[PDB]
Amino acid sequence: DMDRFIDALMKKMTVEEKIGQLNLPVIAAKIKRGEVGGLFNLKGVEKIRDVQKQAVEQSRLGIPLLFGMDVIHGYETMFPIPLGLSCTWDMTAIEESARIAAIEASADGISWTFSPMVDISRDPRWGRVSEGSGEDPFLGAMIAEAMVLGYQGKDMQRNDEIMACVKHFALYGAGEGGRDYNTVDMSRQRMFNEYMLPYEAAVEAGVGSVMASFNEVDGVPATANKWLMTDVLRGQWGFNGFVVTDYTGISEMIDHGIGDLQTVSARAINAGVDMDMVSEGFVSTLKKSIQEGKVSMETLNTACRRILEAKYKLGLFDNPYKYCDLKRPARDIFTKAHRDAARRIAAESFVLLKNDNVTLRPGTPAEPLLPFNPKGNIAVIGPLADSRTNMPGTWSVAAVLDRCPSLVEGLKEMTAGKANILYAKGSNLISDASYEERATMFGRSLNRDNRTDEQLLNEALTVANQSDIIIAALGESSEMSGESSSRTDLNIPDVQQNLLKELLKTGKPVVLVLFTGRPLTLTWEQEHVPAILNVWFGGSEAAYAIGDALFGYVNPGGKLTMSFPKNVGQIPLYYAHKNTGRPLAQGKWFEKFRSNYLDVDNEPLYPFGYGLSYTTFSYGDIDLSRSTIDMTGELTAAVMVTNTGTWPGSEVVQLYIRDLVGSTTRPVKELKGFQKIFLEPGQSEIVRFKIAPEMLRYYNYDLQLVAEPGEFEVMIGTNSRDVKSARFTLK
Amino acid sequence: DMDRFIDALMKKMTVEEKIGQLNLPVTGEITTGQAKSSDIAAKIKRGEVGGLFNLKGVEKIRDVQKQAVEQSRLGIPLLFGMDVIHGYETMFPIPLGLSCTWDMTAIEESARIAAIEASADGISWTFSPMVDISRDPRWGRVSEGSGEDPFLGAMIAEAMVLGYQGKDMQRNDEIMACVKHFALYGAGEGGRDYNTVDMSRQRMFNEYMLPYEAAVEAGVGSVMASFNEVDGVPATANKWLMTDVLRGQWGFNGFVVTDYTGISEMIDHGIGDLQTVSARAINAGVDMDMVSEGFVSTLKKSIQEGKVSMETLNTACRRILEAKYKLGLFDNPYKYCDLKRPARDIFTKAHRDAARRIAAESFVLLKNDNVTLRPGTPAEPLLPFNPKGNIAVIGPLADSRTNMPGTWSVAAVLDRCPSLVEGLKEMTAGKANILYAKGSNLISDASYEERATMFGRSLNRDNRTDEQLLNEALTVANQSDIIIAALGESSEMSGESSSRTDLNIPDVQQNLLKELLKTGKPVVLVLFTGRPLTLTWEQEHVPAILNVWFGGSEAAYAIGDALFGYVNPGGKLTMSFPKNVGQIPLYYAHKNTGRPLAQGKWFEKFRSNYLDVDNEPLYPFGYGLSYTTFSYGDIDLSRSTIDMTGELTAAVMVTNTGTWPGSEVVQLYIRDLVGSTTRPVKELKGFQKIFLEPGQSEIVRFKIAPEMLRYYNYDLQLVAEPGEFEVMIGTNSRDVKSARFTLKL
Ligand SMILES: [Mg+2]
Ligand SMILES: [Mg+2]
């Protein structure tokens, strides 16, 4: 068993060797000296197996390395960016995507992924919303569990299972101004009720590791916050794994302004940080701090033991080359089977935001543009129409970017012999050249040239006037989101929106195929464009998935997981908000002396849980099996859902609960369940949710997790806004 | 003594009479909320009323006080309250504008004058000062406060309280003040009034609380509970706030009043029914119920049921009686009911002359670039200029009397204030011709204009086309020697329940501005606003920009004073002006983060920065220009190391290097370089407003002591830690000279 093996190995180690287990650089001589616990961002089973060999046969002790990577939404087969993927509301598919990424990464030497990212954000200015699962902790928690299980399985003993790492602990999504890395501040009550659940869910799913965040919390960088890294993570949640820093998290505490490298390195290990990514703080200062009494041998031994336990649980002491089978890449990476799964999941992720009836043929009743049969001349226009490299999304560091089909390429393939795909670039990404350069970093160039926006527009209008339909492929480049990609404006960029306006003016039907890593401010587009399909960034097979949706091979069933505001001046806008003492009643905007603005109502353009279908669904009234239950009781909430349109399709039936009165103020609703159903036209299904007091608990003023007696409102519907309602009492 | 008198009075009182002292109905003509009261005369007779508010006029107040004194069983006199915010009838600048004077003597003076006028007319109690810290210029109530900084906020709070109350409120021209809104109301989410507030305890104490504490320590007689929740509890039910901090920590001896229907609004907040939330309020330390009738209609039942004790009720009642006693109302119920005072104390020339001086002192010169007026002559700034020829005054703020005083002017006579055109015409009679055109409406949307001009601020929008308005303005402009573009907000685009998601000069006004600039005539933007605006376009394109906020009843004259060079602008901003609303919140006293963007390095991947704009406000905290220029020598520190017992002096020579006499606000900032928690990159810890003649120099000296270096650490201990400090002095928070020193144990 483990405790004896590790007891025995640690009794053999020098202090330098114990310190070395805590070092994660991004070398050959360091491994020989036992100064390396793991490496990251090394790609290829060949390079990795050879680094493992050195560790195993050329260090005094032969301790095997962990090999890490940001395997975030795929290894080479790229699934949608996590924010897009969350809109599937499909935990089975989400688990599957993680399973596949693990199969591919493990095939190539990787034993550890820095995933899932589970940070709640209510602030769409932050580029890293693309990396998460939206604004809601219940859904965030369910996804956290699905991802951990996908990567790790039961117990990481299979050679196609790897160690997951829940990040970024904690509260990194609340950075002020939506500006990445910026100050975070909130009450403890808000932390636990509104931000913490997804981290806790990952811990409770058995996640092997946790990554400490860049932000301060209560004026202490998270990487030195003992309350977080020990008292909450271990003391409250019983986490048995290890904590890694984010990239140079330790030395960045110097800039944060809490001390010199020795001081913050000591504070980090004393807080419960076990492994040091890149900074070399632990390696270069811990011996000196042990000599001065600033860090005890107990503390060092604990950190070391945790690293060794992780290696042992991965089976690395049984076999250092568990994940170095040179025959696996050919069998496991970028296979048709995997790519087909990615295409299926990508189509499932898209959110149909609008699909109004349009007058297509003179005299006929108006009908929607989507879906359409692939025939005639199909214009595909815009700076996202013919880019391979922008398809997979940000966070695709192992992807072969220029191997992904562009939208034009994929639609060409899918329509060959049936329709002509007519391309025009239409516009640059944005007017400002310098902006375009930074927005297309990391190999995402759109090959901007000397052609002016007027030139590009004119060419596009010529093409558009040759066509029967216009697919406007517009929005963000993939690197307008991700890390260090914060925006103060959330529009479709200037020249693209002008292009869109001019395309509409041709009188040809226009479908907006929107690429984005985040919520955008879309009021103009909602007013003027007949059809809006949010495709996020769908991964390496996005082009094919988009064709599937456009041509009706798949009926869109995605639902938003983050509010879409009308303007940046409404931020933060989130569905699970408090009522205030002066709530504006529905339809009363504007009212003086209510909580409202002079210039816009309080509502998002599209709420949490919003998404349309090529069919329609109708909800009957809610049946509650009980009108009252006590602290040990239960009841069932039941609703009949009917497919009332002409298309087979899926619906995400959403369960919300409002605690009407609290000892503290409670949100106007909270997601507490969901079921994704598939119905043929005319078919009905009674959807049942079990409601029990465990679900009704919340962190009160004293941070006691309790359900208080009183009345609750149960709401069920197609999104967080449009719901059927019923009430019951807890005694 | 007071205790004996109050003991005796309380011995006579029924439970209903003690409950009645906690009740504050609304009456009169002033509207500051939705709910209205009824049956007040009979309620007073029954002893069910402790005070009233929104009643204006000494004759009306005297009649009502005579009903209280002569016709209730016990004759207990009423408090009479009003929002006397920046003036009674003689109106000073809106508080946010006034804060830009950086002149505590003038601020105190303005409060003194307001107290003299209000007290002359029956008022014993003002709901002032508002001291809420805000970093969010979307919020309309930034107009009512003193900006984003707690040090300056605290000094202003003291100045206002002292101005209203004096030493002890004994004089008949002294009134009770009420610090509001306790607490954290300026941090409402989205900048949307009344919305959720949430923050850490450390943030509360380091960043938000000091101004409330300063008012308490100045002896403020009352505190107003805020509308927002704090830690999930409406402030009106928050016992930690209203008891533990206010009384427990700060030793407040006065009483707590709610804001307007604050108690019944807790039902909406979602913490229970009227009885439950009223019981919670009084148990928390709330003593007086504004309008809701929570206390009067439910406390007896709660007392019968054991939800509120007799000791709790007695304590709340005693606090109200103590307030009345300290104001001298038991000695003389009619102290403030001198029917002959209004004719001699209100809206006098002396008061109005002071308001005119203080208004000119409040303006902030944001830009004043050289312009070539005529070939062969070197370029000069447009401001100041001699009044001569044809001076155009154009825009929707050009000829509006009622928009001059600003929001929260509930007792002002709005249509008596001169418009800008009227004032400039008076000031230039026989010297220049004042030409006028409205030029544009306030904003394209007529429904918005209506709600923005409520409370008697109509601009008299007509059915003229934008074409008619613009063409008339262009005909004026093309005959004019200079154009005064009087643009910006209407007064009620700020104040309560006036939040904006866009902070531009409104559409049709900005279009007007573009067209005026296109004439090629020289254009001065005289900008009216209650809040920071997003002015990047204007800073690029307009030669001269004078921020006049809302100057009060004499604003038009003060504006003439500045334009014509009778006064040299010396105002400095007290709140950051963002480049766009996507940067909110911007504030100068911010943490470094772990990935600070080095100066001049925008854009850098993997630093804390945005893709589309740099991190900086257009105009930083403390920003303001003059008709002259000031230069700063290097800082001289008297020693480089001190201990906790010591002190040092930071000195710098400031020289007037320009051609005009004028004032400079010399600002002291300190950075605690290393902390056990992260510390702001700077914090204002002092200032001195100096006046220099051209060529004159002055050595400005600041005492720096360890007491100034304290902050609330992780454990909320108010401590100074040993280590390095950076002393910064300069003309605003951005442009500073630096020196370093060490603090030791
Ligand atoms: Mg309840
Ligand atoms: Mg220090």
mmCIF file with all atom_site columns, N, CA, C and O in Angstrom, chain A residues 176-177 180 185 187 216 267 438 485 488 569 574 592 595 597 599 663 665, chain B residues 138 189-190 193 198 200 203 229 232 280 498 501 587 605 608 610 612 676 678:
data_model
loop_
_atom_site.group_PDB
_atom_site.id
_atom_site.type_symbol
_atom_site.label_atom_id
_atom_site.label_alt_id
_atom_site.label_comp_id
_atom_site.label_asym_id
_atom_site.label_entity_id
_atom_site.label_seq_id
_atom_site.pdbx_PDB_ins_code
_atom_site.Cartn_x
_atom_site.Cartn_y
_atom_site.Cartn_z
_atom_site.occupancy
_atom_site.B_iso_or_equiv
_atom_site.pdbx_formal_charge
_atom_site.auth_seq_id
_atom_site.auth_comp_id
_atom_site.auth_asym_id
_atom_site.auth_atom_id
_atom_site.pdbx_PDB_model_num
ATOM 1   N N  . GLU A 1 176 ? -12.049 42.951 -11.370 1.00 0.00 ? 176 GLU A N  1
ATOM 2   C CA . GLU A 1 176 ? -12.718 44.227 -11.547 1.00 0.00 ? 176 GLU A CA 1
ATOM 3   C C  . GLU A 1 176 ? -12.574 44.744 -12.958 1.00 0.00 ? 176 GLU A C  1
ATOM 4   O O  . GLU A 1 176 ? -11.528 44.596 -13.578 1.00 0.00 ? 176 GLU A O  1
ATOM 5   N N  . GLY A 1 177 ? -13.645 45.345 -13.465 1.00 0.00 ? 177 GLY A N  1
ATOM 6   C CA . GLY A 1 177 ? -13.630 45.876 -14.812 1.00 0.00 ? 177 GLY A CA 1
ATOM 7   C C  . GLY A 1 177 ? -13.628 44.827 -15.903 1.00 0.00 ? 177 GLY A C  1
ATOM 8   O O  . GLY A 1 177 ? -13.456 45.166 -17.069 1.00 0.00 ? 177 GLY A O  1
ATOM 9   N N  . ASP A 1 180 ? -8.467  41.139 -17.050 1.00 0.00 ? 180 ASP A N  1
ATOM 10  C CA . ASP A 1 180 ? -7.847  39.889 -16.589 1.00 0.00 ? 180 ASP A CA 1
ATOM 11  C C  . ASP A 1 180 ? -6.789  40.212 -15.530 1.00 0.00 ? 180 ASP A C  1
ATOM 12  O O  . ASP A 1 180 ? -6.078  41.219 -15.641 1.00 0.00 ? 180 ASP A O  1
ATOM 13  N N  . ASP A 1 185 ? -12.881 41.250 -5.128  1.00 0.00 ? 185 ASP A N  1
ATOM 14  C CA . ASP A 1 185 ? -13.347 41.500 -3.780  1.00 0.00 ? 185 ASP A CA 1
ATOM 15  C C  . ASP A 1 185 ? -14.814 41.136 -3.647  1.00 0.00 ? 185 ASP A C  1
ATOM 16  O O  . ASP A 1 185 ? -15.628 41.549 -4.466  1.00 0.00 ? 185 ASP A O  1
ATOM 17  N N  . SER A 1 187 ? -17.857 39.516 -0.363  1.00 0.00 ? 187 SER A N  1
ATOM 18  C CA . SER A 1 187 ? -18.157 38.974 0.965   1.00 0.00 ? 187 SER A CA 1
ATOM 19  C C  . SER A 1 187 ? -17.984 37.449 0.971   1.00 0.00 ? 187 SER A C  1
ATOM 20  O O  . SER A 1 187 ? -17.981 36.799 -0.082  1.00 0.00 ? 187 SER A O  1
ATOM 21  N N  . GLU A 1 216 ? -5.937  38.346 -6.148  1.00 0.00 ? 216 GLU A N  1
ATOM 22  C CA . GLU A 1 216 ? -6.144  38.453 -4.711  1.00 0.00 ? 216 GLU A CA 1
ATOM 23  C C  . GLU A 1 216 ? -7.596  38.137 -4.288  1.00 0.00 ? 216 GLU A C  1
ATOM 24  O O  . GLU A 1 216 ? -8.528  38.266 -5.083  1.00 0.00 ? 216 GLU A O  1
ATOM 25  N N  . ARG A 1 267 ? 5.274   31.894 2.326   1.00 0.00 ? 267 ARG A N  1
ATOM 26  C CA . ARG A 1 267 ? 3.862   32.083 2.600   1.00 0.00 ? 267 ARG A CA 1
ATOM 27  C C  . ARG A 1 267 ? 3.002   31.131 1.758   1.00 0.00 ? 267 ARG A C  1
ATOM 28  O O  . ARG A 1 267 ? 2.018   30.576 2.242   1.00 0.00 ? 267 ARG A O  1
ATOM 29  N N  . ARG A 1 438 ? -2.962  42.143 -32.686 1.00 0.00 ? 438 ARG A N  1
ATOM 30  C CA . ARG A 1 438 ? -3.015  41.499 -31.360 1.00 0.00 ? 438 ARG A CA 1
ATOM 31  C C  . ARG A 1 438 ? -4.186  40.506 -31.203 1.00 0.00 ? 438 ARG A C  1
ATOM 32  O O  . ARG A 1 438 ? -4.074  39.522 -30.481 1.00 0.00 ? 438 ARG A O  1
ATOM 33  N N  . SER A 1 485 ? -7.331  38.744 -22.761 1.00 0.00 ? 485 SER A N  1
ATOM 34  C CA . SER A 1 485 ? -8.127  39.165 -23.915 1.00 0.00 ? 485 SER A CA 1
ATOM 35  C C  . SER A 1 485 ? -9.455  39.738 -23.413 1.00 0.00 ? 485 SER A C  1
ATOM 36  O O  . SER A 1 485 ? -10.543 39.203 -23.654 1.00 0.00 ? 485 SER A O  1
ATOM 37  N N  . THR A 1 488 ? -13.536 46.137 -23.596 1.00 0.00 ? 488 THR A N  1
ATOM 38  C CA . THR A 1 488 ? -14.432 47.185 -23.063 1.00 0.00 ? 488 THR A CA 1
ATOM 39  C C  . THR A 1 488 ? -15.671 47.458 -23.901 1.00 0.00 ? 488 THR A C  1
ATOM 40  O O  . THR A 1 488 ? -16.637 48.011 -23.378 1.00 0.00 ? 488 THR A O  1
ATOM 41  N N  . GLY A 1 569 ? -22.820 49.110 -20.165 1.00 0.00 ? 569 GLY A N  1
ATOM 42  C CA . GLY A 1 569 ? -23.319 49.832 -19.005 1.00 0.00 ? 569 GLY A CA 1
ATOM 43  C C  . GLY A 1 569 ? -24.251 49.075 -18.082 1.00 0.00 ? 569 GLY A C  1
ATOM 44  O O  . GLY A 1 569 ? -24.437 49.519 -16.951 1.00 0.00 ? 569 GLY A O  1
ATOM 45  N N  . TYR A 1 574 ? -27.014 39.332 -14.403 1.00 0.00 ? 574 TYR A N  1
ATOM 46  C CA . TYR A 1 574 ? -27.116 37.886 -14.167 1.00 0.00 ? 574 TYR A CA 1
ATOM 47  C C  . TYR A 1 574 ? -28.491 37.546 -13.638 1.00 0.00 ? 574 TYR A C  1
ATOM 48  O O  . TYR A 1 574 ? -29.130 38.382 -13.002 1.00 0.00 ? 574 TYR A O  1
ATOM 49  N N  . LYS A 1 592 ? -39.566 56.447 -12.028 1.00 0.00 ? 592 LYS A N  1
ATOM 50  C CA . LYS A 1 592 ? -38.739 57.164 -11.064 1.00 0.00 ? 592 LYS A CA 1
ATOM 51  C C  . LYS A 1 592 ? -38.933 56.533 -9.675  1.00 0.00 ? 592 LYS A C  1
ATOM 52  O O  . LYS A 1 592 ? -40.039 56.101 -9.324  1.00 0.00 ? 592 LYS A O  1
ATOM 53  N N  . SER A 1 595 ? -35.480 50.738 -8.964  1.00 0.00 ? 595 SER A N  1
ATOM 54  C CA . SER A 1 595 ? -34.142 50.340 -9.392  1.00 0.00 ? 595 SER A CA 1
ATOM 55  C C  . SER A 1 595 ? -34.134 50.148 -10.902 1.00 0.00 ? 595 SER A C  1
ATOM 56  O O  . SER A 1 595 ? -34.498 49.085 -11.399 1.00 0.00 ? 595 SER A O  1
ATOM 57  N N  . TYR A 1 597 ? -32.550 52.267 -14.892 1.00 0.00 ? 597 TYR A N  1
ATOM 58  C CA . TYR A 1 597 ? -31.750 53.265 -15.593 1.00 0.00 ? 597 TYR A CA 1
ATOM 59  C C  . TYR A 1 597 ? -32.622 54.205 -16.427 1.00 0.00 ? 597 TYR A C  1
ATOM 60  O O  . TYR A 1 597 ? -33.728 53.829 -16.851 1.00 0.00 ? 597 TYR A O  1
ATOM 61  N N  . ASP A 1 599 ? -31.911 55.109 -19.532 1.00 0.00 ? 599 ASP A N  1
ATOM 62  C CA . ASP A 1 599 ? -31.641 54.927 -20.957 1.00 0.00 ? 599 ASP A CA 1
ATOM 63  C C  . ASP A 1 599 ? -31.838 53.515 -21.529 1.00 0.00 ? 599 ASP A C  1
ATOM 64  O O  . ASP A 1 599 ? -31.773 53.354 -22.737 1.00 0.00 ? 599 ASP A O  1
ATOM 65  N N  . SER A 1 663 ? -33.687 34.801 5.936   1.00 0.00 ? 663 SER A N  1
ATOM 66  C CA . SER A 1 663 ? -33.086 35.579 7.006   1.00 0.00 ? 663 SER A CA 1
ATOM 67  C C  . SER A 1 663 ? -32.086 36.577 6.420   1.00 0.00 ? 663 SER A C  1
ATOM 68  O O  . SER A 1 663 ? -31.809 37.607 7.025   1.00 0.00 ? 663 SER A O  1
ATOM 69  N N  . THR A 1 665 ? -31.317 38.163 2.162   1.00 0.00 ? 665 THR A N  1
ATOM 70  C CA . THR A 1 665 ? -32.059 38.280 0.902   1.00 0.00 ? 665 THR A CA 1
ATOM 71  C C  . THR A 1 665 ? -31.622 37.149 -0.036  1.00 0.00 ? 665 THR A C  1
ATOM 72  O O  . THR A 1 665 ? -30.434 36.800 -0.087  1.00 0.00 ? 665 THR A O  1
ATOM 73  N N  . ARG B 2 138 ? -21.860 55.751 -13.457 1.00 0.00 ? 138 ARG B N  1
ATOM 74  C CA . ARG B 2 138 ? -23.237 55.455 -13.890 1.00 0.00 ? 138 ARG B CA 1
ATOM 75  C C  . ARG B 2 138 ? -24.294 55.890 -12.861 1.00 0.00 ? 138 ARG B C  1
ATOM 76  O O  . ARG B 2 138 ? -25.389 56.314 -13.232 1.00 0.00 ? 138 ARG B O  1
ATOM 77  N N  . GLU B 2 189 ? -24.644 47.499 -7.611  1.00 0.00 ? 189 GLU B N  1
ATOM 78  C CA . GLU B 2 189 ? -24.251 46.834 -8.837  1.00 0.00 ? 189 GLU B CA 1
ATOM 79  C C  . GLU B 2 189 ? -24.792 47.505 -10.079 1.00 0.00 ? 189 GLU B C  1
ATOM 80  O O  . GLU B 2 189 ? -25.927 47.975 -10.121 1.00 0.00 ? 189 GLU B O  1
ATOM 81  N N  . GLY B 2 190 ? -23.948 47.535 -11.098 1.00 0.00 ? 190 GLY B N  1
ATOM 82  C CA . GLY B 2 190 ? -24.291 48.134 -12.369 1.00 0.00 ? 190 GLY B CA 1
ATOM 83  C C  . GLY B 2 190 ? -24.378 49.648 -12.364 1.00 0.00 ? 190 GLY B C  1
ATOM 84  O O  . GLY B 2 190 ? -24.769 50.237 -13.369 1.00 0.00 ? 190 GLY B O  1
ATOM 85  N N  . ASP B 2 193 ? -29.250 52.528 -9.343  1.00 0.00 ? 193 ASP B N  1
ATOM 86  C CA . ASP B 2 193 ? -29.644 52.967 -8.009  1.00 0.00 ? 193 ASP B CA 1
ATOM 87  C C  . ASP B 2 193 ? -30.468 51.876 -7.314  1.00 0.00 ? 193 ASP B C  1
ATOM 88  O O  . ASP B 2 193 ? -31.285 51.173 -7.934  1.00 0.00 ? 193 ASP B O  1
ATOM 89  N N  . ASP B 2 198 ? -22.209 44.383 -2.472  1.00 0.00 ? 198 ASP B N  1
ATOM 90  C CA . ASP B 2 198 ? -21.468 43.294 -1.855  1.00 0.00 ? 198 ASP B CA 1
ATOM 91  C C  . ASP B 2 198 ? -19.995 43.624 -1.843  1.00 0.00 ? 198 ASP B C  1
ATOM 92  O O  . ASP B 2 198 ? -19.417 44.017 -2.861  1.00 0.00 ? 198 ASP B O  1
ATOM 93  N N  . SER B 2 200 ? -16.104 42.838 0.748   1.00 0.00 ? 200 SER B N  1
ATOM 94  C CA . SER B 2 200 ? -15.451 42.258 1.914   1.00 0.00 ? 200 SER B CA 1
ATOM 95  C C  . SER B 2 200 ? -15.439 43.276 3.044   1.00 0.00 ? 200 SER B C  1
ATOM 96  O O  . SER B 2 200 ? -15.534 44.490 2.806   1.00 0.00 ? 200 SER B O  1
ATOM 97  N N  . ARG B 2 203 ? -12.542 45.684 2.573   1.00 0.00 ? 203 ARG B N  1
ATOM 98  C CA . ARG B 2 203 ? -12.837 46.742 1.618   1.00 0.00 ? 203 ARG B CA 1
ATOM 99  C C  . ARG B 2 203 ? -13.711 47.814 2.253   1.00 0.00 ? 203 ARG B C  1
ATOM 100 O O  . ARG B 2 203 ? -13.460 48.991 2.048   1.00 0.00 ? 203 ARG B O  1
ATOM 101 N N  . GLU B 2 229 ? -28.848 46.421 0.528   1.00 0.00 ? 229 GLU B N  1
ATOM 102 C CA . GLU B 2 229 ? -28.326 45.353 1.382   1.00 0.00 ? 229 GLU B CA 1
ATOM 103 C C  . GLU B 2 229 ? -26.807 45.405 1.563   1.00 0.00 ? 229 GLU B C  1
ATOM 104 O O  . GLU B 2 229 ? -26.067 45.927 0.722   1.00 0.00 ? 229 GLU B O  1
ATOM 105 N N  . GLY B 2 232 ? -26.085 40.583 2.529   1.00 0.00 ? 232 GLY B N  1
ATOM 106 C CA . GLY B 2 232 ? -27.410 39.986 2.364   1.00 0.00 ? 232 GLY B CA 1
ATOM 107 C C  . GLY B 2 232 ? -28.498 40.497 3.297   1.00 0.00 ? 232 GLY B C  1
ATOM 108 O O  . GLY B 2 232 ? -29.614 39.987 3.275   1.00 0.00 ? 232 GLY B O  1
ATOM 109 N N  . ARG B 2 280 ? -37.181 43.778 13.321  1.00 0.00 ? 280 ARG B N  1
ATOM 110 C CA . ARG B 2 280 ? -35.759 43.584 13.047  1.00 0.00 ? 280 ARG B CA 1
ATOM 111 C C  . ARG B 2 280 ? -35.004 44.905 12.971  1.00 0.00 ? 280 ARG B C  1
ATOM 112 O O  . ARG B 2 280 ? -33.891 45.012 13.463  1.00 0.00 ? 280 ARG B O  1
ATOM 113 N N  . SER B 2 498 ? -31.445 58.160 -11.051 1.00 0.00 ? 498 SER B N  1
ATOM 114 C CA . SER B 2 498 ? -31.014 58.743 -12.323 1.00 0.00 ? 498 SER B CA 1
ATOM 115 C C  . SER B 2 498 ? -29.690 58.104 -12.700 1.00 0.00 ? 498 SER B C  1
ATOM 116 O O  . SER B 2 498 ? -28.654 58.748 -12.668 1.00 0.00 ? 498 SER B O  1
ATOM 117 N N  . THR B 2 501 ? -26.416 54.231 -18.465 1.00 0.00 ? 501 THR B N  1
ATOM 118 C CA . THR B 2 501 ? -25.552 53.168 -19.001 1.00 0.00 ? 501 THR B CA 1
ATOM 119 C C  . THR B 2 501 ? -24.601 53.707 -20.087 1.00 0.00 ? 501 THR B C  1
ATOM 120 O O  . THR B 2 501 ? -23.632 53.042 -20.415 1.00 0.00 ? 501 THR B O  1
ATOM 121 N N  . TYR B 2 587 ? -10.439 53.864 -10.660 1.00 0.00 ? 587 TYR B N  1
ATOM 122 C CA . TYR B 2 587 ? -10.168 54.654 -9.486  1.00 0.00 ? 587 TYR B CA 1
ATOM 123 C C  . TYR B 2 587 ? -8.682  54.636 -9.261  1.00 0.00 ? 587 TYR B C  1
ATOM 124 O O  . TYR B 2 587 ? -8.022  53.622 -9.515  1.00 0.00 ? 587 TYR B O  1
ATOM 125 N N  . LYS B 2 605 ? 0.408   41.503 -24.139 1.00 0.00 ? 605 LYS B N  1
ATOM 126 C CA . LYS B 2 605 ? -0.211  40.228 -23.830 1.00 0.00 ? 605 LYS B CA 1
ATOM 127 C C  . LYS B 2 605 ? 0.363   39.687 -22.509 1.00 0.00 ? 605 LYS B C  1
ATOM 128 O O  . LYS B 2 605 ? 1.553   39.870 -22.212 1.00 0.00 ? 605 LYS B O  1
ATOM 129 N N  . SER B 2 608 ? -2.210  42.806 -17.094 1.00 0.00 ? 608 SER B N  1
ATOM 130 C CA . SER B 2 608 ? -3.578  43.251 -16.781 1.00 0.00 ? 608 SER B CA 1
ATOM 131 C C  . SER B 2 608 ? -3.923  44.488 -17.605 1.00 0.00 ? 608 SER B C  1
ATOM 132 O O  . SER B 2 608 ? -3.619  45.614 -17.230 1.00 0.00 ? 608 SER B O  1
ATOM 133 N N  . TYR B 2 610 ? -6.600  45.699 -21.384 1.00 0.00 ? 610 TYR B N  1
ATOM 134 C CA . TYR B 2 610 ? -7.658  45.383 -22.340 1.00 0.00 ? 610 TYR B CA 1
ATOM 135 C C  . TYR B 2 610 ? -7.119  45.425 -23.776 1.00 0.00 ? 610 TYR B C  1
ATOM 136 O O  . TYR B 2 610 ? -6.167  46.152 -24.088 1.00 0.00 ? 610 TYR B O  1
ATOM 137 N N  . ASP B 2 612 ? -8.666  46.892 -26.295 1.00 0.00 ? 612 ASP B N  1
ATOM 138 C CA . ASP B 2 612 ? -9.233  47.997 -27.083 1.00 0.00 ? 612 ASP B CA 1
ATOM 139 C C  . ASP B 2 612 ? -9.055  49.404 -26.527 1.00 0.00 ? 612 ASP B C  1
ATOM 140 O O  . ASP B 2 612 ? -9.452  50.369 -27.169 1.00 0.00 ? 612 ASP B O  1
ATOM 141 N N  . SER B 2 676 ? 1.318   43.060 4.387   1.00 0.00 ? 676 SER B N  1
ATOM 142 C CA . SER B 2 676 ? 0.847   41.703 4.689   1.00 0.00 ? 676 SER B CA 1
ATOM 143 C C  . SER B 2 676 ? -0.384  41.359 3.831   1.00 0.00 ? 676 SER B C  1
ATOM 144 O O  . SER B 2 676 ? -0.681  40.192 3.590   1.00 0.00 ? 676 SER B O  1
ATOM 145 N N  . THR B 2 678 ? -2.227  43.226 0.080   1.00 0.00 ? 678 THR B N  1
ATOM 146 C CA . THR B 2 678 ? -1.876  44.133 -1.010  1.00 0.00 ? 678 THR B CA 1
ATOM 147 C C  . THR B 2 678 ? -2.396  45.536 -0.701  1.00 0.00 ? 678 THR B C  1
ATOM 148 O O  . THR B 2 678 ? -3.504  45.685 -0.199  1.00 0.00 ? 678 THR B O  1
#
